[PDB]
Amino acid sequence: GSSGSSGPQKIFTPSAEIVKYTKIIAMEKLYAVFTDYEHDKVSRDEAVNKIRLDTEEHLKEKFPEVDQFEIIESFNIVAKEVFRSIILNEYKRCDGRDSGPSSG
């Protein structure tokens, strides 16, 4: 057993069970907020962060046994995950031509 962060020693990851459910909610929203709030710069600032507070109340509720630190730290990993996927449809080049239906 060990504890305390120091050196090249990596940190432990949160609960996967949640992280997964965090995407179904974080994703949808994150995408619903990204697609919109273009004109306004701050309008999107709150839309994104807001989730961090929303999901936290939507997850910690589903997992009453899980720790609060598992509902937050988990999201972080989820967020970054989405963004990347969003960058594939904006600020990119030669993403990958398509022959058939893209959105079906």
Side-chain angles (χ1 to χ4, degrees):
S2 279
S3 53
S5 312
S6 50
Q9 289 284 82
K10 87 196 278 277
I11 292 192
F12 319 92
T13 49
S15 302
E17 65 202 19
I18 313 191
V19 175
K20 277 158 80 74
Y21 191 78
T22 313
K23 272 152 203 200
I24 285 90
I25 62 192
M27 193 152 292
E28 273 197 293
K29 299 156 188 297
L30 288 162
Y31 270 101
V33 295
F34 209 132
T35 302
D36 286 35
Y37 312 147
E38 301 171 334
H39 313 138
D40 297 49
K41 270 190 275 283
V42 180
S43 202
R44 60 179 282 177
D45 171 48
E46 59 84 52
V48 181
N49 207 100
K50 272 279 169 81
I51 300 159
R52 174 172 271 188
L53 310 151
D54 190 335
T55 50
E56 151 59 31
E57 294 162 315
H58 184 71
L59 303 168
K60 187 196 193 189
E61 86 173 22
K62 173 163 173 65
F63 314 68
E65 58 166 68
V66 168
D67 205 66
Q68 175 271 26
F69 165 55
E70 278 42 305
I71 285 83
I72 285 79
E73 210 72 348
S74 50
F75 178 94
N76 282 256
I77 296 89
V78 169
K80 62 177 270 88
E81 204 61 42
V82 183
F83 270 95
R84 177 167 285 197
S85 282
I86 299 163
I87 303 315
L88 272 76
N89 210 284
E90 74 185 14
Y91 183 44
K92 270 282 282 284
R93 184 164 285 176
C94 209
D95 290 303
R97 58 200 290 202
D98 288 58
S99 173
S102 274
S103 209

XYZ file of all heavy atoms in Angstrom:
831
model
N 0.807 -1.207 0.000
C 0.000 0.000 0.000
C 0.842 1.260 0.000
O 1.928 1.289 0.579
N 0.342 2.304 -0.651
C 1.058 3.572 -0.729
C 0.085 4.737 -0.883
O -1.070 4.549 -1.263
C 2.041 3.556 -1.900
O 3.235 2.875 -1.556
N 0.562 5.941 -0.585
C -0.266 7.138 -0.686
C 0.599 8.386 -0.832
O 1.794 8.365 -0.539
C -1.165 7.267 0.545
O -0.406 7.196 1.741
N -0.014 9.474 -1.288
C 0.714 10.717 -1.466
C 1.315 10.843 -2.851
O 1.963 9.919 -3.341
N 1.098 11.991 -3.486
C 1.619 12.233 -4.827
C 2.989 12.900 -4.765
O 3.162 13.930 -4.112
C 0.648 13.108 -5.623
O -0.679 12.623 -5.517
N 3.960 12.307 -5.450
C 5.318 12.842 -5.470
C 6.201 12.044 -6.426
O 6.323 10.825 -6.305
C 5.918 12.819 -4.063
O 5.756 11.548 -3.460
N 6.815 12.741 -7.376
C 7.680 12.083 -8.339
C 6.928 11.621 -9.571
O 5.785 12.011 -9.809
N 7.578 10.771 -10.380
C 6.984 10.239 -11.610
C 5.850 9.258 -11.327
O 5.276 8.678 -12.249
C 8.153 9.523 -12.288
C 9.077 9.166 -11.174
C 8.943 10.265 -10.158
N 5.533 9.079 -10.050
C 4.468 8.168 -9.647
C 3.111 8.669 -10.129
O 2.646 9.732 -9.715
C 4.454 8.006 -8.126
C 5.634 7.214 -7.587
C 5.494 5.723 -7.822
O 5.788 5.224 -8.909
N 5.044 5.003 -6.802
N 2.479 7.899 -11.009
C 1.175 8.264 -11.549
C 0.094 8.160 -10.477
O 0.329 7.618 -9.396
C 0.821 7.364 -12.734
C 0.135 6.069 -12.331
C 0.145 5.056 -13.464
C -0.981 5.314 -14.453
N -2.270 4.729 -13.988
N -1.089 8.681 -10.784
C -2.204 8.644 -9.847
C -3.230 7.592 -10.256
O -3.293 7.189 -11.417
C -2.902 10.013 -9.749
C -1.977 11.034 -9.086
C -4.205 9.889 -8.972
C -2.677 12.316 -8.689
N -4.033 7.150 -9.293
C -5.058 6.146 -9.552
C -6.248 6.758 -10.285
O -6.571 7.931 -10.097
C -5.522 5.512 -8.240
C -4.404 5.235 -7.277
C -4.048 6.171 -6.319
C -3.706 4.039 -7.331
C -3.019 5.920 -5.432
C -2.676 3.782 -6.445
C -2.332 4.724 -5.496
N -6.897 5.955 -11.122
C -8.050 6.416 -11.884
C -9.346 6.184 -11.116
O -9.443 5.296 -10.269
C -8.141 5.708 -13.250
O -8.013 4.293 -13.076
C -7.057 6.209 -14.192
N -10.368 6.999 -11.418
C -11.678 6.898 -10.768
C -12.433 5.638 -11.176
O -11.870 4.741 -11.801
C -12.415 8.146 -11.261
C -11.766 8.480 -12.560
C -10.324 8.078 -12.418
N -13.712 5.579 -10.816
C -14.544 4.426 -11.142
C -14.951 4.448 -12.612
O -15.393 5.472 -13.130
C -15.791 4.405 -10.256
O -15.441 4.365 -8.884
N -14.797 3.309 -13.279
C -15.149 3.195 -14.689
C -16.663 3.156 -14.875
O -17.208 3.838 -15.742
C -14.510 1.954 -15.294
N -17.336 2.355 -14.054
C -18.785 2.228 -14.132
C -19.440 3.588 -14.356
O -20.320 3.732 -15.206
C -19.332 1.592 -12.852
C -19.129 2.447 -11.612
C -19.172 1.637 -10.332
O -19.004 0.401 -10.404
O -19.372 2.239 -9.255
N -19.004 4.581 -13.589
C -19.546 5.930 -13.704
C -19.052 6.614 -14.975
O -19.846 7.003 -15.833
C -19.169 6.795 -12.488
C -19.437 6.033 -11.189
C -19.942 8.105 -12.510
C -19.347 6.897 -9.951
N -17.736 6.756 -15.089
C -17.134 7.392 -16.256
C -17.922 7.072 -17.523
O -18.137 7.940 -18.368
C -15.673 6.946 -16.446
C -15.102 7.520 -17.735
C -14.829 7.359 -15.250
N -18.348 5.820 -17.646
C -19.113 5.383 -18.809
C -20.450 6.114 -18.885
O -20.822 6.640 -19.934
C -19.348 3.872 -18.752
C -18.181 3.055 -19.279
C -18.199 1.638 -18.729
C -19.189 0.761 -19.481
N -18.687 0.394 -20.834
N -21.167 6.144 -17.768
C -22.464 6.810 -17.710
C -22.304 8.324 -17.813
O -23.253 9.039 -18.136
C -23.186 6.451 -16.410
C -24.633 6.890 -16.381
C -25.613 6.165 -17.047
C -25.020 8.029 -15.687
C -26.936 6.561 -17.023
C -26.341 8.434 -15.656
C -27.294 7.697 -16.327
O -28.612 8.095 -16.300
N -21.095 8.804 -17.539
C -20.809 10.233 -17.601
C -20.751 10.719 -19.045
O -20.943 11.904 -19.320
C -19.478 10.570 -16.904
O -19.412 9.914 -15.632
C -19.332 12.072 -16.714
N -20.486 9.798 -19.965
C -20.403 10.132 -21.382
C -21.796 10.309 -21.980
O -22.039 11.244 -22.745
C -19.645 9.041 -22.141
C -18.143 9.258 -22.180
C -17.391 7.942 -22.287
C -15.964 8.073 -21.781
N -15.092 6.980 -22.292
N -22.706 9.407 -21.628
C -24.074 9.467 -22.128
C -24.714 10.816 -21.818
O -25.550 11.305 -22.578
C -24.943 8.347 -21.525
C -24.598 7.003 -22.167
C -26.419 8.666 -21.708
C -23.503 6.250 -21.443
N -24.315 11.411 -20.700
C -24.849 12.704 -20.292
C -23.907 13.837 -20.689
O -24.321 14.810 -21.318
C -25.089 12.760 -18.772
C -23.769 12.574 -18.018
C -26.097 11.700 -18.355
C -23.951 12.322 -16.537
N -22.638 13.701 -20.319
C -21.637 14.711 -20.639
C -21.528 14.917 -22.146
O -21.512 16.050 -22.627
C -20.286 14.317 -20.060
N -21.453 13.815 -22.886
C -21.346 13.877 -24.338
C -22.489 14.693 -24.934
O -22.276 15.791 -25.448
C -21.349 12.466 -24.932
C -20.927 12.420 -26.391
S -20.158 10.853 -26.842
C -18.636 10.938 -25.902
N -23.700 14.150 -24.860
C -24.874 14.829 -25.393
C -24.793 16.333 -25.145
O -24.734 17.127 -26.084
C -26.149 14.266 -24.760
C -26.699 13.047 -25.481
C -28.137 12.748 -25.106
O -28.382 12.385 -23.937
O -29.018 12.876 -25.982
N -24.790 16.718 -23.873
C -24.715 18.125 -23.500
C -23.512 18.798 -24.152
O -23.665 19.685 -24.994
C -24.628 18.266 -21.979
C -25.826 17.688 -21.244
C -25.475 17.307 -19.817
C -26.608 16.544 -19.148
N -27.837 17.375 -19.019
N -22.316 18.370 -23.762
C -21.086 18.931 -24.310
C -21.239 19.225 -25.799
O -20.794 20.265 -26.286
C -19.920 17.969 -24.085
C -19.421 17.843 -22.645
C -18.595 16.578 -22.474
C -18.609 19.070 -22.253
N -21.871 18.302 -26.516
C -22.082 18.462 -27.951
C -23.203 19.459 -28.229
O -23.145 20.223 -29.193
C -22.413 17.114 -28.592
C -21.195 16.356 -29.070
C -20.669 15.305 -28.328
C -20.569 16.690 -30.266
C -19.557 14.611 -28.761
C -19.457 16.000 -30.707
C -18.954 14.961 -29.951
O -17.846 14.273 -30.387
N -24.222 19.446 -27.377
C -25.357 20.349 -27.527
C -24.952 21.791 -27.237
O -25.559 22.732 -27.748
C -26.495 19.924 -26.613
N -23.923 21.957 -26.412
C -23.437 23.284 -26.053
C -22.376 23.765 -27.036
O -22.288 24.955 -27.338
C -22.849 23.301 -24.630
C -23.932 23.018 -23.601
C -21.714 22.295 -24.511
N -21.571 22.832 -27.533
C -20.514 23.160 -28.482
C -21.101 23.626 -29.810
O -20.733 24.680 -30.330
C -19.610 21.947 -28.710
C -18.196 22.311 -29.063
C -17.129 21.714 -28.411
C -17.934 23.251 -30.047
C -15.826 22.047 -28.734
C -16.634 23.587 -30.375
C -15.579 22.985 -29.716
N -22.019 22.834 -30.356
C -22.658 23.164 -31.624
C -23.230 24.576 -31.600
O -23.215 25.279 -32.612
C -23.785 22.170 -31.960
O -23.266 20.837 -32.008
C -24.431 22.516 -33.294
N -23.734 24.986 -30.442
C -24.310 26.316 -30.287
C -23.414 27.199 -29.424
O -22.336 26.782 -29.000
C -25.704 26.222 -29.665
C -26.744 25.720 -30.649
O -26.400 24.864 -31.491
O -27.901 26.184 -30.577
N -23.867 28.422 -29.168
C -23.105 29.366 -28.358
C -21.840 29.810 -29.086
O -20.800 30.032 -28.467
C -22.738 28.735 -27.014
C -23.904 28.068 -26.319
C -23.713 26.943 -25.527
C -25.195 28.562 -26.456
C -24.775 26.328 -24.891
C -26.262 27.955 -25.822
C -26.048 26.839 -25.041
O -27.109 26.231 -24.411
N -21.939 29.939 -30.405
C -20.804 30.358 -31.219
C -20.617 31.872 -31.155
O -19.534 32.362 -30.837
C -20.997 29.917 -32.671
C -21.154 28.414 -32.835
C -21.557 28.021 -34.242
O -22.175 28.855 -34.937
O -21.256 26.879 -34.649
N -21.681 32.606 -31.462
C -21.637 34.063 -31.440
C -21.099 34.571 -30.106
O -20.185 35.396 -30.067
C -23.029 34.642 -31.696
C -23.734 34.015 -32.858
N -25.072 33.680 -32.836
C -23.280 33.661 -34.083
C -25.410 33.148 -33.997
N -24.341 33.126 -34.772
N -21.671 34.073 -29.015
C -21.248 34.475 -27.679
C -20.045 33.658 -27.220
O -19.967 32.454 -27.468
C -22.401 34.312 -26.686
C -23.582 35.202 -27.018
O -24.013 35.203 -28.190
O -24.075 35.899 -26.106
N -19.108 34.319 -26.549
C -17.908 33.656 -26.055
C -18.120 33.133 -24.637
O -17.666 32.042 -24.293
C -16.719 34.619 -26.083
C -15.944 34.591 -27.389
C -14.641 35.365 -27.281
C -14.851 36.849 -27.541
N -15.002 37.143 -28.992
N -18.812 33.919 -23.819
C -19.086 33.535 -22.440
C -20.278 32.588 -22.360
O -20.290 31.655 -21.557
C -19.363 34.767 -21.558
C -19.643 34.346 -20.124
C -18.194 35.739 -21.619
N -21.280 32.835 -23.198
C -22.480 32.006 -23.220
C -22.117 30.524 -23.206
O -22.804 29.711 -22.586
C -23.322 32.324 -24.457
O -24.672 31.935 -24.269
N -21.033 30.181 -23.893
C -20.577 28.797 -23.961
C -19.714 28.448 -22.752
O -19.641 27.290 -22.342
C -19.789 28.559 -25.251
C -18.550 29.432 -25.376
C -17.791 29.140 -26.661
N -16.994 27.921 -26.560
C -16.293 27.416 -27.570
N -16.289 28.023 -28.748
N -15.592 26.302 -27.401
N -19.061 29.458 -22.187
C -18.202 29.259 -21.026
C -18.989 28.655 -19.867
O -18.514 27.739 -19.194
C -17.575 30.585 -20.596
C -16.853 30.481 -19.266
O -16.061 29.532 -19.096
O -17.082 31.348 -18.396
N -20.191 29.173 -19.639
C -21.041 28.685 -18.559
C -21.729 27.382 -18.955
O -21.935 26.499 -18.124
C -22.090 29.737 -18.191
C -22.989 30.132 -19.351
C -24.155 29.181 -19.536
O -24.870 28.921 -18.546
O -24.352 28.698 -20.670
N -22.081 27.270 -20.233
C -22.743 26.075 -20.740
C -21.894 24.832 -20.500
O -22.403 23.791 -20.082
C -23.048 26.231 -22.223
N -20.597 24.946 -20.766
C -19.677 23.831 -20.578
C -19.488 23.518 -19.098
O -19.810 22.423 -18.640
C -18.303 24.125 -21.209
C -17.364 22.943 -21.021
C -18.456 24.467 -22.683
N -18.963 24.488 -18.356
C -18.731 24.316 -16.926
C -19.993 23.826 -16.225
O -19.954 22.877 -15.442
C -18.265 25.633 -16.302
C -17.418 25.417 -15.062
O -16.190 25.488 -15.116
N -18.073 25.154 -13.938
N -21.114 24.480 -16.513
C -22.391 24.112 -15.912
C -22.492 22.599 -15.734
O -22.770 22.112 -14.637
C -23.549 24.612 -16.777
C -23.984 26.030 -16.449
C -24.899 26.066 -15.236
C -25.127 27.489 -14.751
N -26.165 28.190 -15.556
N -22.265 21.864 -16.817
C -22.328 20.409 -16.779
C -21.571 19.857 -15.575
O -22.130 19.118 -14.764
C -21.750 19.786 -18.064
C -22.539 20.261 -19.286
C -21.768 18.268 -17.971
C -21.780 20.120 -20.587
N -20.299 20.223 -15.465
C -19.465 19.765 -14.360
C -20.257 19.739 -13.056
O -20.021 18.896 -12.190
C -18.240 20.669 -14.208
C -17.398 20.351 -12.983
C -16.097 21.140 -12.982
N -15.028 20.431 -13.679
C -13.763 20.839 -13.693
N -13.413 21.945 -13.052
N -12.846 20.139 -14.349
N -21.198 20.669 -12.922
C -22.025 20.753 -11.725
C -23.284 19.906 -11.870
O -23.748 19.295 -10.907
C -22.406 22.208 -11.446
C -21.255 23.215 -11.440
C -21.744 24.588 -11.875
C -20.615 23.285 -10.061
N -23.830 19.870 -13.081
C -25.033 19.093 -13.354
C -24.756 17.599 -13.225
O -25.325 16.922 -12.367
C -25.561 19.407 -14.755
C -26.938 18.821 -15.000
O -27.285 17.823 -14.333
O -27.668 19.359 -15.857
N -23.880 17.087 -14.084
C -23.530 15.672 -14.068
C -23.194 15.206 -12.656
O -23.639 14.144 -12.223
C -22.332 15.380 -14.991
O -21.265 16.293 -14.715
C -22.737 15.494 -16.454
N -22.407 16.007 -11.944
C -22.012 15.674 -10.581
C -23.230 15.313 -9.734
O -23.150 14.474 -8.838
C -21.263 16.844 -9.942
C -21.419 16.917 -8.432
C -20.921 15.667 -7.734
O -19.972 15.038 -8.247
O -21.481 15.319 -6.674
N -24.358 15.955 -10.026
C -25.591 15.704 -9.291
C -26.387 14.571 -9.934
O -27.288 14.003 -9.317
C -26.445 16.973 -9.234
C -25.812 18.095 -8.430
C -26.427 19.449 -8.735
O -26.619 19.757 -9.930
O -26.715 20.198 -7.779
N -26.046 14.249 -11.178
C -26.727 13.184 -11.906
C -26.014 11.849 -11.711
O -26.610 10.785 -11.879
C -26.802 13.522 -13.395
C -27.577 12.523 -14.198
N -28.946 12.387 -14.110
C -27.167 11.611 -15.110
C -29.345 11.432 -14.931
N -28.285 10.945 -15.550
N -24.736 11.914 -11.354
C -23.941 10.711 -11.136
C -23.939 10.319 -9.663
O -24.393 9.235 -9.297
C -22.506 10.931 -11.619
C -22.346 11.350 -13.080
C -20.923 11.816 -13.350
C -22.718 10.203 -14.009
N -23.426 11.208 -8.819
C -23.368 10.959 -7.384
C -24.696 10.408 -6.874
O -24.747 9.755 -5.832
C -23.016 12.246 -6.635
C -22.779 12.039 -5.149
C -22.834 13.353 -4.387
C -22.283 13.203 -2.978
N -22.519 14.424 -2.158
N -25.767 10.674 -7.616
C -27.094 10.204 -7.237
C -27.274 8.733 -7.601
O -27.837 7.954 -6.832
C -28.172 11.046 -7.921
C -28.536 10.557 -9.312
C -29.720 11.297 -9.901
O -29.992 12.431 -9.453
O -30.376 10.743 -10.808
N -26.793 8.359 -8.783
C -26.899 6.982 -9.251
C -26.009 6.056 -8.429
O -26.349 4.897 -8.194
C -26.515 6.895 -10.731
C -26.431 5.471 -11.254
C -26.458 5.433 -12.772
C -26.213 4.027 -13.299
N -27.306 3.093 -12.912
N -24.867 6.577 -7.991
C -23.927 5.797 -7.194
C -23.771 6.395 -5.799
O -22.839 7.149 -5.520
C -22.566 5.733 -7.889
C -22.655 5.418 -9.355
C -23.208 6.329 -10.240
C -22.186 4.211 -9.848
C -23.293 6.041 -11.590
C -22.268 3.918 -11.196
C -22.820 4.835 -12.068
N -24.705 6.051 -4.900
C -24.694 6.542 -3.519
C -23.550 5.949 -2.702
O -23.130 6.525 -1.700
C -26.044 6.077 -2.966
C -26.402 4.890 -3.792
C -25.845 5.156 -5.163
N -23.052 4.797 -3.139
C -21.957 4.127 -2.447
C -20.610 4.687 -2.892
O -19.649 4.709 -2.123
C -22.007 2.620 -2.706
C -21.931 2.252 -4.178
C -21.652 0.778 -4.398
O -22.537 -0.046 -4.086
O -20.549 0.448 -4.881
N -20.545 5.137 -4.142
C -19.317 5.697 -4.690
C -18.947 7.002 -3.992
O -19.799 7.665 -3.402
C -19.444 5.956 -6.203
C -18.284 6.806 -6.700
C -19.518 4.642 -6.964
N -17.670 7.363 -4.063
C -17.187 8.588 -3.439
C -17.379 9.783 -4.367
O -17.339 9.644 -5.589
C -15.711 8.448 -3.066
C -15.310 9.366 -1.929
O -15.804 9.162 -0.800
O -14.504 10.290 -2.167
N -17.590 10.957 -3.779
C -17.789 12.175 -4.554
C -16.585 12.456 -5.447
O -16.725 13.010 -6.537
C -18.037 13.362 -3.622
C -18.142 14.694 -4.348
C -16.799 15.379 -4.507
O -15.755 14.727 -4.528
N -16.819 16.702 -4.617
N -15.404 12.071 -4.976
C -14.175 12.283 -5.731
C -14.140 11.397 -6.973
O -13.327 11.605 -7.874
C -12.955 11.997 -4.853
C -11.677 11.851 -5.629
C -11.261 12.848 -6.496
C -10.894 10.718 -5.492
C -10.086 12.715 -7.213
C -9.718 10.579 -6.206
C -9.313 11.581 -7.066
N -15.026 10.408 -7.013
C -15.096 9.490 -8.143
C -16.047 10.017 -9.215
O -15.961 9.628 -10.380
C -15.553 8.106 -7.677
C -14.433 7.258 -7.099
C -13.504 8.052 -6.200
O -12.970 9.083 -6.660
O -13.314 7.642 -5.036
N -16.951 10.902 -8.811
C -17.917 11.482 -9.736
C -17.330 12.692 -10.455
O -17.740 13.024 -11.569
C -19.207 11.907 -9.010
C -20.052 10.678 -8.664
C -20.003 12.878 -9.868
C -19.626 9.995 -7.383
N -16.368 13.346 -9.814
C -15.724 14.518 -10.394
C -14.534 14.118 -11.259
O -14.577 14.237 -12.484
C -15.246 15.495 -9.303
C -16.436 16.246 -8.705
C -14.230 16.472 -9.877
C -17.211 15.437 -7.689
N -13.474 13.641 -10.615
C -12.272 13.222 -11.327
C -12.631 12.424 -12.577
O -11.949 12.511 -13.598
C -11.377 12.382 -10.413
C -9.897 12.500 -10.736
C -9.316 13.842 -10.334
O -10.103 14.756 -10.009
O -8.075 13.977 -10.343
N -13.706 11.648 -12.489
C -14.154 10.831 -13.611
C -14.550 11.707 -14.796
O -14.102 11.487 -15.921
C -15.336 9.955 -13.191
O -16.334 10.722 -12.542
N -15.394 12.699 -14.534
C -15.853 13.608 -15.578
C -14.675 14.156 -16.377
O -14.640 14.052 -17.603
C -16.650 14.761 -14.965
C -17.112 15.773 -15.974
C -18.372 15.678 -16.544
C -16.286 16.820 -16.354
C -18.799 16.608 -17.474
C -16.709 17.752 -17.282
C -17.966 17.647 -17.842
N -13.713 14.743 -15.674
C -12.533 15.310 -16.316
C -12.096 14.457 -17.503
O -11.978 14.949 -18.625
C -11.386 15.431 -15.310
C -11.547 16.627 -14.391
O -10.873 17.643 -14.555
N -12.442 16.508 -13.418
N -11.858 13.175 -17.246
C -11.437 12.252 -18.293
C -12.462 12.194 -19.421
O -12.104 12.106 -20.595
C -11.220 10.832 -17.738
C -10.080 10.827 -16.718
C -10.930 9.858 -18.871
C -10.534 11.102 -15.302
N -13.739 12.247 -19.056
C -14.817 12.204 -20.036
C -14.800 13.442 -20.926
O -14.806 13.338 -22.151
C -16.193 12.094 -19.353
C -17.309 12.323 -20.361
C -16.345 10.740 -18.676
N -14.780 14.614 -20.299
C -14.760 15.873 -21.033
C -13.725 15.839 -22.153
O -14.072 15.856 -23.334
C -14.479 17.031 -20.087
N -12.452 15.790 -21.775
C -11.366 15.753 -22.747
C -11.665 14.754 -23.860
O -11.375 15.008 -25.028
C -10.050 15.386 -22.058
C -10.061 14.007 -21.422
C -8.713 13.663 -20.812
C -7.807 12.967 -21.817
N -7.025 13.942 -22.626
N -12.249 13.619 -23.488
C -12.588 12.582 -24.457
C -13.497 13.136 -25.551
O -13.240 12.948 -26.740
C -13.271 11.405 -23.759
C -13.150 10.094 -24.517
C -11.710 9.649 -24.687
O -10.931 9.776 -23.719
O -11.362 9.175 -25.789
N -14.560 13.820 -25.140
C -15.506 14.403 -26.083
C -14.827 15.432 -26.978
O -14.794 15.284 -28.201
C -16.687 15.070 -25.354
C -17.696 15.611 -26.355
C -17.345 14.089 -24.397
N -14.284 16.477 -26.362
C -13.604 17.534 -27.103
C -12.882 16.966 -28.320
O -13.164 17.345 -29.456
C -12.608 18.262 -26.197
C -13.203 19.437 -25.476
C -13.686 19.302 -24.184
C -13.279 20.678 -26.089
C -14.233 20.383 -23.519
C -13.825 21.761 -25.428
C -14.302 21.614 -24.141
N -11.946 16.055 -28.074
C -11.180 15.435 -29.148
C -12.091 15.037 -30.305
O -11.837 15.387 -31.458
C -10.432 14.206 -28.628
C -9.672 13.454 -29.707
C -8.701 12.449 -29.107
N -7.521 13.098 -28.543
C -6.392 12.454 -28.262
N -6.293 11.152 -28.493
N -5.361 13.113 -27.750
N -13.153 14.303 -29.990
C -14.101 13.853 -31.004
C -14.712 15.041 -31.741
O -15.016 14.957 -32.931
C -15.206 13.013 -30.362
O -14.755 11.697 -30.091
N -14.888 16.146 -31.025
C -15.462 17.352 -31.611
C -14.462 18.046 -32.529
O -14.847 18.711 -33.492
C -15.918 18.343 -30.524
C -17.004 17.713 -29.651
C -16.422 19.630 -31.159
C -17.219 18.434 -28.338
N -13.179 17.885 -32.227
C -12.124 18.494 -33.027
C -12.001 17.812 -34.385
O -11.337 18.321 -35.290
C -10.763 18.430 -32.308
C -10.851 19.112 -30.941
C -9.682 19.078 -33.160
C -11.582 20.436 -30.972
N -12.646 16.659 -34.522
C -12.612 15.907 -35.772
C -13.577 16.502 -36.793
O -13.546 16.146 -37.970
C -12.963 14.440 -35.516
C -11.794 13.524 -35.153
C -11.359 13.759 -33.714
C -12.172 12.065 -35.366
N -14.430 17.411 -36.333
C -15.402 18.057 -37.206
C -15.244 19.574 -37.169
O -16.195 20.313 -37.423
C -16.824 17.670 -36.796
C -17.784 17.661 -37.970
O -18.209 18.714 -38.447
N -18.129 16.469 -38.442
N -14.037 20.030 -36.850
C -13.756 21.459 -36.778
C -12.274 21.709 -36.511
O -11.676 21.081 -35.638
C -14.600 22.114 -35.682
C -14.128 21.792 -34.275
C -15.050 22.350 -33.208
O -16.181 22.749 -33.553
O -14.639 22.386 -32.029
N -11.690 22.630 -37.268
C -10.278 22.961 -37.116
C -9.397 21.774 -37.489
O -8.360 21.534 -36.869
C -9.987 23.395 -35.679
C -8.556 23.833 -35.457
C -7.913 24.663 -36.366
C -7.848 23.418 -34.336
C -6.606 25.064 -36.168
C -6.542 23.815 -34.128
C -5.925 24.638 -35.047
O -4.624 25.037 -34.844
N -9.815 21.033 -38.510
C -9.065 19.870 -38.970
C -8.866 19.914 -40.482
O -9.354 20.822 -41.154
C -9.790 18.581 -38.577
C -9.385 18.047 -37.213
C -8.051 17.323 -37.271
C -8.199 15.926 -37.855
N -8.803 14.979 -36.878
N -8.150 18.927 -41.009
C -7.888 18.852 -42.441
C -7.813 17.401 -42.906
O -7.168 16.568 -42.270
C -6.584 19.576 -42.781
C -6.283 19.622 -44.270
C -5.222 20.664 -44.592
N -5.750 22.023 -44.517
C -5.004 23.110 -44.679
N -3.706 22.997 -44.923
N -5.557 24.314 -44.597
N -8.478 17.107 -44.017
C -8.489 15.756 -44.567
C -8.941 14.745 -43.517
O -8.348 13.675 -43.376
C -7.098 15.383 -45.085
S -7.114 14.203 -46.456
N -9.992 15.093 -42.784
C -10.524 14.216 -41.746
C -10.702 12.796 -42.274
O -10.262 11.832 -41.651
C -11.860 14.754 -41.231
C -11.699 16.032 -40.429
O -10.943 16.017 -39.435
O -12.329 17.046 -40.796
N -11.355 12.676 -43.427
C -11.582 11.371 -44.018
C -12.802 11.345 -44.916
O -13.913 11.078 -44.458
N -12.596 11.624 -46.199
C -13.690 11.635 -47.163
C -14.642 10.468 -46.919
O -14.257 9.450 -46.342
C -13.141 11.569 -48.589
C -12.286 10.342 -48.857
C -11.393 10.540 -50.072
N -12.156 10.554 -51.316
C -11.627 10.292 -52.506
N -10.339 9.995 -52.613
N -12.387 10.325 -53.594
N -15.885 10.623 -47.360
C -16.893 9.582 -47.190
C -17.626 9.316 -48.501
O -17.836 10.226 -49.302
C -17.892 9.983 -46.104
C -17.292 9.922 -44.714
O -16.282 10.616 -44.472
O -17.833 9.181 -43.866
N -18.012 8.062 -48.713
C -18.717 7.674 -49.929
C -20.206 7.487 -49.657
O -21.049 7.840 -50.481
C -18.125 6.384 -50.499
O -18.902 5.899 -51.580
N -20.524 6.929 -48.493
C -21.911 6.703 -48.131
C -22.437 7.751 -47.171
O -21.912 8.861 -47.081
N -23.502 7.402 -46.433
C -24.124 8.308 -45.463
C -23.237 8.552 -44.246
O -22.726 7.610 -43.640
C -25.400 7.568 -45.054
C -25.099 6.130 -45.300
C -24.179 6.096 -46.489
N -23.060 9.820 -43.894
C -22.232 10.188 -42.750
C -23.030 10.106 -41.453
O -22.613 9.455 -40.495
C -21.675 11.602 -42.931
O -20.469 11.583 -43.676
N -24.180 10.771 -41.430
C -25.036 10.777 -40.250
C -26.282 9.927 -40.478
O -27.275 10.396 -41.033
C -25.441 12.210 -39.894
O -25.669 12.344 -38.502
N -26.222 8.672 -40.043
C -27.351 7.775 -40.208
C -27.545 6.861 -39.015
O -27.063 5.728 -39.007
